């Protein structure tokens, strides 16, 4: 589970073949669905909105409550 620390609203959009971008607000908790070592973009579900999509991995970090 990752927590968003920097907002993300589709700018820049996911690289070519990656799917739809996922809108993220600082503090949103994301459940990861796809995250590979060779790629800078991950896929997951924003549990605040139930929406699924891609986002740059540099906008999140482990969620520790």
PDB file of C-alpha atoms in Angstrom:
ATOM      1  CA  UNK A   1       0.000   0.000   0.000  1.00  0.00           C
ATOM      2  CA  UNK A   2       1.433   3.344  -1.049  1.00  0.00           C
ATOM      3  CA  UNK A   3       0.531   6.836   0.080  1.00  0.00           C
ATOM      4  CA  UNK A   4       0.656   9.694  -2.425  1.00  0.00           C
ATOM      5  CA  UNK A   5       2.986  12.555  -1.337  1.00  0.00           C
ATOM      6  CA  UNK A   6       2.810  14.626  -4.548  1.00  0.00           C
ATOM      7  CA  UNK A   7      -0.397  15.296  -6.551  1.00  0.00           C
ATOM      8  CA  UNK A   8      -0.765  13.774 -10.007  1.00  0.00           C
ATOM      9  CA  UNK A   9      -3.457  14.759 -12.506  1.00  0.00           C
ATOM     10  CA  UNK A  10      -2.252  13.266 -15.769  1.00  0.00           C
ATOM     11  CA  UNK A  11       0.504  15.733 -16.558  1.00  0.00           C
ATOM     12  CA  UNK A  12       2.741  14.345 -17.897  1.00  0.00           C
ATOM     13  CA  UNK A  13       0.563  11.532 -19.287  1.00  0.00           C
ATOM     14  CA  UNK A  14       1.633   7.865 -18.947  1.00  0.00           C
ATOM     15  CA  UNK A  15       4.295   6.816 -21.544  1.00  0.00           C
ATOM     16  CA  UNK A  16       2.916   5.631 -24.868  1.00  0.00           C
ATOM     17  CA  UNK A  17       1.663   2.100 -24.234  1.00  0.00           C
ATOM     18  CA  UNK A  18       0.735   2.541 -20.557  1.00  0.00           C
ATOM     19  CA  UNK A  19      -3.014   2.722 -19.980  1.00  0.00           C
ATOM     20  CA  UNK A  20      -5.202   5.549 -18.582  1.00  0.00           C
ATOM     21  CA  UNK A  21      -3.603   7.777 -15.974  1.00  0.00           C
ATOM     22  CA  UNK A  22      -4.865   7.591 -12.405  1.00  0.00           C
ATOM     23  CA  UNK A  23      -5.639  10.897 -10.646  1.00  0.00           C
ATOM     24  CA  UNK A  24      -3.873  11.114  -7.269  1.00  0.00           C
ATOM     25  CA  UNK A  25      -4.268  13.618  -4.422  1.00  0.00           C
ATOM     26  CA  UNK A  26      -1.606  13.918  -1.697  1.00  0.00           C
ATOM     27  CA  UNK A  27      -2.611  11.520   1.045  1.00  0.00           C
ATOM     28  CA  UNK A  28      -4.630   9.146  -1.135  1.00  0.00           C
ATOM     29  CA  UNK A  29      -3.833   5.491  -0.338  1.00  0.00           C
ATOM     30  CA  UNK A  30      -3.158   3.381  -3.441  1.00  0.00           C
ATOM     31  CA  UNK A  31      -3.308  -0.449  -3.789  1.00  0.00           C
ATOM     32  CA  UNK A  32      -0.728  -1.469  -6.392  1.00  0.00           C
ATOM     33  CA  UNK A  33      -1.795  -3.713  -9.243  1.00  0.00           C
ATOM     34  CA  UNK A  34       1.320  -3.607 -11.486  1.00  0.00           C
ATOM     35  CA  UNK A  35       4.820  -2.460 -10.508  1.00  0.00           C
ATOM     36  CA  UNK A  36       7.907  -3.749 -12.316  1.00  0.00           C
ATOM     37  CA  UNK A  37      11.536  -2.928 -11.600  1.00  0.00           C
ATOM     38  CA  UNK A  38      12.407  -1.843 -15.123  1.00  0.00           C
ATOM     39  CA  UNK A  39       9.612   0.733 -15.414  1.00  0.00           C
ATOM     40  CA  UNK A  40       9.139   4.170 -13.946  1.00  0.00           C
ATOM     41  CA  UNK A  41       5.345   3.929 -14.044  1.00  0.00           C
ATOM     42  CA  UNK A  42       3.135   1.748 -11.882  1.00  0.00           C
ATOM     43  CA  UNK A  43      -0.526   0.788 -12.023  1.00  0.00           C
ATOM     44  CA  UNK A  44      -2.874   0.652  -9.053  1.00  0.00           C
ATOM     45  CA  UNK A  45      -6.257   1.487  -7.540  1.00  0.00           C
ATOM     46  CA  UNK A  46      -6.723   4.803  -5.738  1.00  0.00           C
ATOM     47  CA  UNK A  47      -8.758   3.527  -2.747  1.00  0.00           C
ATOM     48  CA  UNK A  48     -10.144   7.051  -2.204  1.00  0.00           C
ATOM     49  CA  UNK A  49     -11.942   6.947  -5.578  1.00  0.00           C
ATOM     50  CA  UNK A  50     -11.879   3.229  -6.622  1.00  0.00           C
ATOM     51  CA  UNK A  51     -10.379   4.379  -9.915  1.00  0.00           C
ATOM     52  CA  UNK A  52      -7.594   2.334 -11.585  1.00  0.00           C
ATOM     53  CA  UNK A  53      -4.710   3.523 -13.780  1.00  0.00           C
ATOM     54  CA  UNK A  54      -1.024   4.432 -14.258  1.00  0.00           C
ATOM     55  CA  UNK A  55       1.044   7.025 -12.441  1.00  0.00           C
ATOM     56  CA  UNK A  56       4.745   7.888 -12.060  1.00  0.00           C
ATOM     57  CA  UNK A  57       6.212   5.843  -9.208  1.00  0.00           C
ATOM     58  CA  UNK A  58       8.099   8.960  -7.982  1.00  0.00           C
ATOM     59  CA  UNK A  59       4.829  10.424  -6.618  1.00  0.00           C
ATOM     60  CA  UNK A  60       4.261   7.736  -3.927  1.00  0.00           C
ATOM     61  CA  UNK A  61       6.010   6.006  -1.011  1.00  0.00           C
ATOM     62  CA  UNK A  62       5.032   3.239   1.460  1.00  0.00           C
ATOM     63  CA  UNK A  63       1.923   4.042   3.498  1.00  0.00           C
ATOM     64  CA  UNK A  64       2.801   3.870   7.190  1.00  0.00           C
ATOM     65  CA  UNK A  65       0.081   4.751   9.674  1.00  0.00           C
TER      66      UNK A  65
END
